[PDB]
């Protein structure tokens, strides 16, 4: 059903479905079994930053994850997204917890998309930036357990009053307007996404992760996609 391309920040090693034995970042092209991963030194309770970049000339989707005063993790994959996704997509953030849990908090999110035509001085662009939310964030579609406005933050999975992360929770937030990622006359198409997140768990093995994704416009949370399937995939294939 849904066409998903995602960059995941996966905190729990489900080695049975192909994860490496550590926290890792990965690029998922239509399956939870990442096409490419890298070890990520996840820091419990610290704000991190993820940068995702792509352009139609190189056809390389790359991601860099960093924490203050630390070395970065980075992963890249050669993929032409014109052959994977529809030309109109929606972009969003998704997260889950399963038996083990964590808060999946989003403190800011920006995205830029550009289509540069072969006509002179002809650029089509979309850009949004959220450094603060609203309880009534009318330009986000919130799905599952995601809520906005808690300390001006976006909470992708259920967090109870006392600040505790809840298990078996899944939530997603997608920007309202469709995003145009191809047009026939375009010489270069590019996008850039950045988000900062706070993953805090009282456990020694937090789970499950955060993912930035791009899907077909009508995408909704697949049934049973809590825990390891990150709110993105119906199964582990």
């Amino acid at each position: 059903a849904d066409t998903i391309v995602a960059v995941e920040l996966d905190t729990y090693p489900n080695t049975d479905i192909g994860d490496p034995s550590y926290p890792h970042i990965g690029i998922d092209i239509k399956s939870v079994r990442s096409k490419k991963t890298a070890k990520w030194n996840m820091q419990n309770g610290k704000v991190g930053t993820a940068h995702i970049i792509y352009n139609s000339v190189d056809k390389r989707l790359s991601a860099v994850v960093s924490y203050p005063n630390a070395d970065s993790a980075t992963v890249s994959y050669d993929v032409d997204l014109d052959n994977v996704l529809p030309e109109w997509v929606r972009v969003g953030l998704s997260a889950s917890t399963g038996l083990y849990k964590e808060t999946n908090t989003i403190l800011s999110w920006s995205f830029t998309s550009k289509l540069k035509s072969n006509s002179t001085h002809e650029t089509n662009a979309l850009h949004f930036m959220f450094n603060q939310f609203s309880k009534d964030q009318k330009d986000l579609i919130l799905q599952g357990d995601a809520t906005t406005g808690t300390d001006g933050n976006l909470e992708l999975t259920r967090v109870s009053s006392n600040g505790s992360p809840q298990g078996s929770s899944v939530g997603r937030a997608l920007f309202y307007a469709p995003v145009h990622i191809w047009e026939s006359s375009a010489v270069v198409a590019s996008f850039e996404a950045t988000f900062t997140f706070l993953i805090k768990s009282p456990d020694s093995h937090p789970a499950d992760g955060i993912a930035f994704f791009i899907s077909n416009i009508d995408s909704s949370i697949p049934s049973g996609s809590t825990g390891r399937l990150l709110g993105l995939f119906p199964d582990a294939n």
Copy 2:
């Protein structure tokens, strides 16, 4: 019903409903009878450019209209939009023809909106730019006779195959995502809009005009708003 703030480029003088005796640009706060106007030297068949700017510190909505190698027309009005509009709005372009007519073509449109909070490094922003359209422009809501894709342009009123403008036509295009123009913690809110247009009429008295507007999110074309009411107002009050 709808809350409309608009900057109009009015090509026909309906002096009976308060227009001056010439083409003019004006600022309409909830009524077709402009709060402020200026003479506009309309050029038939030339591409013009309109720039509209506003910010919450000055509370002045100003507009500048220019044509290549010509002097500009400019109009300004002191108005606090937090006291006129809802905090979530949609923005768009509207046009009509009546007994006299003209093509109301839009060749590009950009908009930027910014909410800067009192928190440090906290800006929320939306920015779109259309230098080219699509027949299937999924991030625009097209109403009435507006169509996209004709020479990559947006045609706000009906134009027949041979390029001729049709009379009694009204059309509007609004960007899909709601726009947030106030929040409680904001120290400055601003927006900026620019569009280029081509008004071509085979008549000596073209009618009726183009307007950039900001309305409540569910705004739709009022019944009977062709001709002088620009697709914006239900009546001439």
Copy 3:
């Protein structure tokens, strides 16, 4: 000699040279005696933010100063800068201490300038943003005691090893490239500046202030402009 337009954040009341009896923000057009002031509730040791905006249609220079979780101070002045400044200027930050002192630290600085011509799709723009400095910041001209690189910050007045502010100190930082603020064919010219600052003083009466300024390109610190003259004016006239 130098042509100075500045927005000052003045921490010490030199009522003898016209200050009000409190910390205040003011707009100086070629003299230290502000054309317009507003009371500013200065917070010792907190990071504040200043936003300065101007455009050639309204001809209003306005400034908003805020601290987290506090109400803002704002001041505005009707002034046409085409009649005060040359068309090529440099922009910068300046600060001083006198007998009383304070740290004048700059943690980030961004500026944008735009000249929009009457020709279609013709915008000339300059934009810089510094969220971090360098010991060797080659695109800043540092004058007097200003230094860069101390905790990635810009220190406009002398601070000794142990973190203490020094008295009788004056420093300025200007961006390297000239800025073009008028051209004959421009229909709208605008600029926007933002900076965050930390004023920390161990005294109950800190002095003297920070100012954002725009000057002629070859401007340098006037002789004797420590203390109340903010590194900007040769005298108190």
Copy 4:
């Protein structure tokens, strides 16, 4: 002496110094003998557009050249610029004519550079855009025969009154401020450059080309670099 990285649009085939037998675009890393080329279908008298992009995660410098209603030419090269260039550079445009000639006119030029640190919300950016020039363009360093202001255009090689291109001419324009392309704490560094150009020659074999380049800050035109050496290299090695 100078460290040059350039993307050239080479109109004349000097097959003796390694050019292919056709107009071509190429990536030069410190030598006129391109590391990589692609056939370019040069159109005499038409305005073209060049887009150059690079980022420190992929380490791929790519360029796309297009003309209206035509197919694009594109060339890419894997190169880590931190190992080739200094961390402070200047960027510019260069062109030459030799025995055969052409006008090398620049109608617009924009550049963006970004350094994103591992600190949260810490981006340093420079952005300029020239859609129009000035006879007194004080933020460009013009070298050799380059002049500004002729029809608001930048003329990189000598053009005489009647509009004719002159032979044996070389000129360069560099933006005034140094550009910072690396810093120790940066997780991603990127830049983007775009320019539109008009190459018009009354000859059947125009020469020599236009190049976008990045050099050390004090770079100046090497002696004898007219014709095939594009104003960039001292020799053909």
